[PDB]
Design an enzyme around this catalytic site. Structure first.
Site, mmCIF file in Angstrom:
data_model
loop_
_atom_site.group_PDB
_atom_site.id
_atom_site.type_symbol
_atom_site.label_atom_id
_atom_site.label_comp_id
_atom_site.label_asym_id
_atom_site.label_seq_id
_atom_site.Cartn_x
_atom_site.Cartn_y
_atom_site.Cartn_z
ATOM 1 N N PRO A 9 -8.463 10.445 -1.730
ATOM 2 C CA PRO A 9 -9.879 10.514 -1.281
ATOM 3 C C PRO A 9 -9.944 9.381 -0.147
ATOM 4 O O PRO A 9 -9.402 8.435 -0.185
ATOM 5 C CB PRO A 9 -10.481 10.075 -2.513
ATOM 6 C CG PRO A 9 -9.827 10.816 -3.677
ATOM 7 C CD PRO A 9 -8.250 10.542 -3.213
ATOM 8 N N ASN A 10 -11.020 9.784 0.710
ATOM 9 C CA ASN A 10 -11.365 8.656 1.817
ATOM 10 C C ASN A 10 -10.167 8.266 2.719
ATOM 11 O O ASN A 10 -10.817 7.892 3.814
ATOM 12 C CB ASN A 10 -11.865 7.412 1.192
ATOM 13 C CG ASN A 10 -12.885 7.478 0.050
ATOM 14 O OD1 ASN A 10 -14.074 7.968 0.674
ATOM 15 N ND2 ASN A 10 -12.801 6.971 -1.013
ATOM 16 N N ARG A 17 -13.413 5.450 10.348
ATOM 17 C CA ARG A 17 -14.301 4.636 9.379
ATOM 18 C C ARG A 17 -14.108 3.219 10.235
ATOM 19 O O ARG A 17 -13.207 2.555 10.266
ATOM 20 C CB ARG A 17 -14.110 4.685 8.022
ATOM 21 C CG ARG A 17 -13.027 3.502 7.494
ATOM 22 C CD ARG A 17 -11.769 4.006 6.646
ATOM 23 N NE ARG A 17 -11.877 3.839 5.157
ATOM 24 C CZ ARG A 17 -10.810 4.053 4.544
ATOM 25 N NH1 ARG A 17 -10.053 4.896 4.674
ATOM 26 N NH2 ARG A 17 -11.155 4.116 3.156
ATOM 27 N N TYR A 22 -12.365 -2.234 11.607
ATOM 28 C CA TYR A 22 -11.519 -1.950 10.414
ATOM 29 C C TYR A 22 -11.089 -0.412 10.781
ATOM 30 O O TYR A 22 -11.203 0.382 9.832
ATOM 31 C CB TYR A 22 -12.307 -2.087 9.075
ATOM 32 C CG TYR A 22 -11.491 -3.198 8.289
ATOM 33 C CD1 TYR A 22 -10.285 -3.646 8.299
ATOM 34 C CD2 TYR A 22 -12.539 -4.163 7.471
ATOM 35 C CE1 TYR A 22 -9.877 -4.447 7.787
ATOM 36 C CE2 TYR A 22 -12.152 -5.128 6.707
ATOM 37 C CZ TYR A 22 -10.782 -5.301 6.942
ATOM 38 O OH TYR A 22 -10.315 -6.472 6.013
ATOM 39 N N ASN A 74 0.124 9.312 -1.170
ATOM 40 C CA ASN A 74 -0.951 8.269 -1.242
ATOM 41 C C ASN A 74 -2.263 8.487 -1.881
ATOM 42 O O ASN A 74 -3.177 9.277 -1.431
ATOM 43 C CB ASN A 74 -1.455 7.842 0.070
ATOM 44 C CG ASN A 74 -2.167 6.724 0.313
ATOM 45 O OD1 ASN A 74 -2.718 5.991 -0.839
ATOM 46 N ND2 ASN A 74 -2.422 5.957 1.325
ATOM 47 N N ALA A 77 -7.655 5.967 -3.992
ATOM 48 C CA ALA A 77 -8.322 5.373 -5.248
ATOM 49 C C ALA A 77 -7.815 5.875 -6.462
ATOM 50 O O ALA A 77 -7.937 5.261 -7.753
ATOM 51 C CB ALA A 77 -9.863 5.718 -5.176
ATOM 52 N N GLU A 98 5.477 6.860 -4.195
ATOM 53 C CA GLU A 98 4.015 6.356 -3.906
ATOM 54 C C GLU A 98 3.849 5.585 -2.655
ATOM 55 O O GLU A 98 4.632 4.813 -2.572
ATOM 56 C CB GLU A 98 3.468 5.870 -5.124
ATOM 57 C CG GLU A 98 2.275 5.455 -5.069
ATOM 58 C CD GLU A 98 1.569 5.010 -6.515
ATOM 59 O OE1 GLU A 98 2.622 5.060 -7.410
ATOM 60 O OE2 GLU A 98 0.391 4.316 -6.400
ATOM 61 N N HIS A 100 1.111 3.181 -0.378
ATOM 62 C CA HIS A 100 -0.195 2.685 0.036
ATOM 63 C C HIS A 100 -0.183 2.098 1.585
ATOM 64 O O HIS A 100 0.516 1.176 1.644
ATOM 65 C CB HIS A 100 -0.805 1.734 -0.906
ATOM 66 C CG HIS A 100 -1.000 2.188 -2.316
ATOM 67 N ND1 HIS A 100 -2.002 2.902 -2.658
ATOM 68 C CD2 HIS A 100 0.138 2.402 -3.482
ATOM 69 C CE1 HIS A 100 -1.650 3.553 -3.715
ATOM 70 N NE2 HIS A 100 -0.710 3.189 -4.249
ATOM 71 N N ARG A 107 -5.506 -7.516 -3.208
ATOM 72 C CA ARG A 107 -6.933 -7.233 -3.359
ATOM 73 C C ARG A 107 -7.395 -7.543 -4.841
ATOM 74 O O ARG A 107 -6.769 -7.952 -5.397
ATOM 75 C CB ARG A 107 -6.956 -5.666 -2.778
ATOM 76 C CG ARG A 107 -6.483 -5.337 -1.510
ATOM 77 C CD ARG A 107 -6.649 -3.949 -0.808
ATOM 78 N NE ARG A 107 -7.928 -3.465 -0.755
ATOM 79 C CZ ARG A 107 -8.429 -2.178 -0.506
ATOM 80 N NH1 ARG A 107 -7.652 -1.317 0.117
ATOM 81 N NH2 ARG A 107 -9.547 -2.104 -0.271
HETATM 82 O O1 LIG Z 1 -8.073 4.124 -0.973
HETATM 83 C C1 LIG Z 1 -7.323 3.266 -0.942
HETATM 84 C C2 LIG Z 1 -6.189 3.408 -0.195
HETATM 85 C C3 LIG Z 1 -4.915 2.544 -0.649
HETATM 86 O O2 LIG Z 1 -4.263 3.631 -1.584
HETATM 87 C C4 LIG Z 1 -4.103 2.281 0.386
HETATM 88 O O3 LIG Z 1 -3.614 3.464 0.868
HETATM 89 O O4 LIG Z 1 -4.478 1.178 0.830
HETATM 90 C C5 LIG Z 1 -5.068 1.535 -1.803
HETATM 91 C C6 LIG Z 1 -6.222 1.953 -2.976
HETATM 92 O O5 LIG Z 1 -6.454 0.947 -3.789
HETATM 93 C C7 LIG Z 1 -7.407 2.345 -2.195
HETATM 94 O O6 LIG Z 1 -8.354 2.902 -3.262
#
Ligand SMILES: O=C1C[C@@](O)(C(=O)O)C[C@@H](O)[C@@H]1O
Ligand SMILES: O=C1C[C@@](O)(C(=O)O)C[C@@H](O)[C@@H]1O
Ligand SMILES: O=C1C[C@@](O)(C(=O)O)C[C@@H](O)[C@@H]1O
Ligand SMILES: O=C1C[C@@](O)(C(=O)O)C[C@@H](O)[C@@H]1O
Ligand code: NA
Ligand code: NA
Ligand code: NA
Ligand code: NA
Lengths: 145, 145, 145, 145
Positions: A9-10, A17, A22, A74, A77, A98, A100, A107
């Site tokens: 997501p996102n 964004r 950012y 990835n 969240a 995985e 990120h 964080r």
């Molecule tokens: O949405 C994200 C992106 C993320 O997975 C990253 O690609 O840095 C890090 C996660 O904690 C966060 O919720």
């Protein structure tokens, strides 16, 4: 397709964004680079993103049936929250890496726990979009000897 | 001395302890592959391995005096124990990337915490010796267009 | 519907994740056994499975409008993560029994906590498909003493 | 006797209060239904209750010597406290199903932990005395298809 890249997501907001406060590159840019990379190695690569957890689970189910050999994910969240994702990847038994973008350990504390990391081949965090390219290089050599 | 790779305790044992199944490459093999990769990029690569925490701390202070630009470190067991390493790296303010050969999330719970990770640019674990090459590629590119 | 059976995410995979290891029992097999058991007691049963949490919430909402008197629910991974499911079941005030196929107490420690169990009439785990049949048995006798 | 049913401390009280925790039935009645259910299937079943942990451990030991194939156990308060009992069932290596009359997850936090449940084939809680009959129905199919 032999490799499936999944984005959670996102991540569709990348560059969209808050650019220069950012932002800068986008998901669509990342996806093109990876397909090209995998094209250089004679490997078919699919990509998928969604803000909906069920869509992702469903997509993982479809991967079993397509004979995807490896998933690069990835989970964004969903990393921190979704046992459903974990049990999808274990249920289909497709190995995964995985990735990120950001260094999760720098964080908030809740970002330090994953429901996937223990079951992954490995994890790359904090190296931006290049993290996906590394995961792909790894995956290519894991498939071709 | 543009890039310094540091290997923590016990990594001198790689490809020693019974080489029948799984992995056979030695620390020496990893080092040569890194130096040849750095040569290609026109970067000078220094390497160092010790079982002694103080020797590692001393080498990092020395990196500052040599004007090293970036460190790639596999702190091995020291990742979980050594505030002194964290302090050396922050004190010299050389950016670093952390690399582990094994997926530490799949191992004992004590191996999930790092006195380094929150300060690293990023972390690569579980991709074997390829992780160090990935770190290097990222580091090379960080200095150079 | 009088009784509704809900299966959560990933239970569609049953019988397809690795038959030599896991077995050939499918979700359809489960549903057929249940429907026949209920046909025998003059009980109408519906079943529902999804990988999407909101479909399961809306399905629960629909049960209140259909006059369902009890839910048998295998929330799968959502037992460990979903307050929304708990809120749905409470919101509609339909009693439920929780069923897991696997003994959850023998697996990872996160599998031991649930957002539902404390509101269930009861829980059955570890007895494979038969756990559902036992729940339906209890349920049939509750509605028809 | 091929199947042994063990009832832990306090369960001799089952007639009186607190009834609202399941139920109005008495132990002699429970054991009379289980004996009958086991007759109609041609299985020899014994039952045992005690308030003394050593007597239960003794009883499980003798079960080994008498050739018992499965135990159905309601350890009552011993579930949360007795490692001796765990070690007894594991020592004689007889498989077992754990039953509780009440939904322990709806009660005080100490009642949510079990020194038995991880080694049980499965667990039924919250279904009253019917949980015993379920446990025996599974047990009968496990020893005679
Ligand atoms: O949405 C994200 C992106 C993320 O997975 C990253 O690609 O840095 C890090 C996660 O904690 C966060 O919720
Ligand atoms: O020694 C090591 C090696 C390690 O850093 C690795 O390279 O996988 C992981 C550490 O937990 C461990 O103490
Ligand atoms: O997804 C599942 C399936 C499960 O509910 C079961 O039926 O065994 C048990 C849960 O821990 C797990 O997350
Ligand atoms: O004695 C009992 C009975 C019980 O095991 C039950 O059958 O619900 C629940 C236990 O926590 C309690 O100590
Ligand atoms: Na990480
Ligand atoms: Na890691
Ligand atoms: Na349980
Ligand atoms: Na229980």
């Amino acid at each position: 397709s032999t490799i499936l890249v999944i984005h959670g997501p996102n991540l569709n907001l990348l560059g969209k964004r808050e650019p220069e406060v950012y932002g800068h590159l986008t998901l669509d840019n990342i996806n093109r680079q990876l397909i090209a990379q995998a094209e250089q190695a004679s490997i078919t690569l699919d990509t998928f993103q969604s803000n909906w957890e069920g869509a992702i689970v469903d997509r993982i189910h479809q991967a079993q049936t397509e004979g995807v050999k490896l998933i690069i994910i990835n989970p964004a969240a969903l990393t921190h929250t979704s046992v459903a994702l974990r049990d999808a990847l274990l249920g289909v038994a497709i190995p995964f890496i995985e990735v990120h973008l950001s260094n999760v350990h720098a964080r908030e504390a809740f970002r330090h726990h994953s429901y996937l990391s223990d079951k992954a081949i490995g994890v790359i965090c904090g190296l931006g979009a290049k993290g996906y390219s590394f995961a792909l290089d790894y995956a290519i050599e894991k498939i071709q000897p």
